[PDB]
Design a protein around this ligand. Structure first.
Ligand code: C6F
Length: 301
């Protein structure tokens, strides 16, 4: 069964487990987002999962013509409804510079299309990896700091909107013009562990997610720490050379944290470590993180 990894939550109490997920299934879709099918000229496939795909297209008159990314299902009615819920969620969220924003949708006369902003340089993980020889076209320490700042800003927006990202990682951040980055939502991949219905990004998950299935904004701070390690290693797999097995679960339970990656300063590393506090209440907030990285970045000589 399909589900979006960006989820709205409502808090029902002060403890981490006191919340529920907001289902938009019973809410009505605002028809001002509806865009004509025939104004999409489909180009190439950008990625496929089991339940769907993201395709490049030219969109005529959506903003004049622009590139877009179009999310769609593969050729059930439950899958259709989940995509509508995601659409309804994204219509209500509002836009932000550091989110992959919804531009429109095609829902009435054919298969469901969700039309998003196109991010011409693809995912941040592959971007970082392609720049390893070209680190001083050229990638710098300041660019890495800027990417970190932008992701934190994106997450601060999601915190403010009462949302959680259940899969924050460099693979789910995209890169567009001007070194702008944007947080996106969405078997062969060894970073996800199969466990019944679930596909778990184990090495990105906070303990309370691993052990109790709890996802809060503070779980996202942990994942953000992992993503920082990805940035400042130029896209190394977290916990490099450590397999995902029952020993991994024990390592995390006992307070195992990664070392300082090569491109991190000591100050960036202290921030990473704070994100990995076992107790969620000791982790910094996203407004804290934007302040710390903004101050680090503001040291551009
Ligand atoms: C909603 C998920 C998603 N949204 C977008 C989006 N809204 O725009 C998106 N775009 C995207 C854009 C461009 C590329 N390319 C092609 C050119 C290539 N070249 C290499 C050679 N070099 C010299 C010049 C650049 C760099 C990668 C791309 O990767 C194929 C994806 N992709 C999304 N999902 C995928 C799932 C599979 O994994 C990555 C993310």
């Amino acid at each position: 069964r399909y589900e979006s990894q960006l989820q709205m939550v409502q808090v029902t109490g002060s403890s981490d487990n006191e919340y529920f997920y907001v289902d938009f299934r019973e809410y009505e879709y605002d028809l001002k987002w509806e865009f004509p099918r025939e104004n999409l000229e489909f180009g190439k496939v950008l990625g496929s999962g089991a339940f769907g795909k993201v395709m490049n297209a030219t969109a005529y008159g959506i903003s004049v013509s622009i590139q877009v990314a179009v999310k769609m299902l593969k050729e059930d009615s439950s899958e259709r409804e989940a995509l509508m819920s995601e659409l309804k969620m994204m219509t209500q969220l509002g836009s932000h510079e550091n989110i992959v924003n919804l531009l429109g949708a095609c829902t009435l006369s054919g298969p469901i299309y969700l039309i998003f902003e196109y991010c011409c340089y693809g995912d941040l993980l592959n971007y970082l990896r392609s720049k390893r020889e070209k680190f001083s076209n050229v990638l710098t320490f300041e660019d890495l700091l800027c990417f970190a700042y932008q992701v934190a800003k994106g997450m601060e927006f999601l915190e403010f909107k009462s949302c959680v990202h259940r899969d924050l990682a460099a693979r789910n951040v995209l890169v567009t013009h001007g070194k702008v980055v944007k947080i996106c939502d969405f078997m062969s991949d060894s970073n996800y562990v199969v466990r019944g219905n679930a596909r778990l990004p184990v090495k990105w998950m906070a303990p309370e997610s691993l052990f109790e299935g709890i996802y809060t904004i503070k779980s996202d701070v942990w994942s953000y720490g992992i993503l920082l390690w990805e940035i400042f290693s130029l896209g190394v797999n977290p916990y490099p050379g450590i397999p995902v097995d029952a020993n991994f679960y024990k390592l995390i339970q006992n307070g195992f944290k990664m070392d300082q990656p090569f491109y991190a300063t000591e100050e960036i590393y202290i921030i990473m470590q704070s994100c990995w506090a076992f107790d969620s209440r000791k982790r910094p907030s996203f407004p804290n993180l934007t302040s710390f990285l903004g101050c680090q970045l503001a040291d551009a000589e």
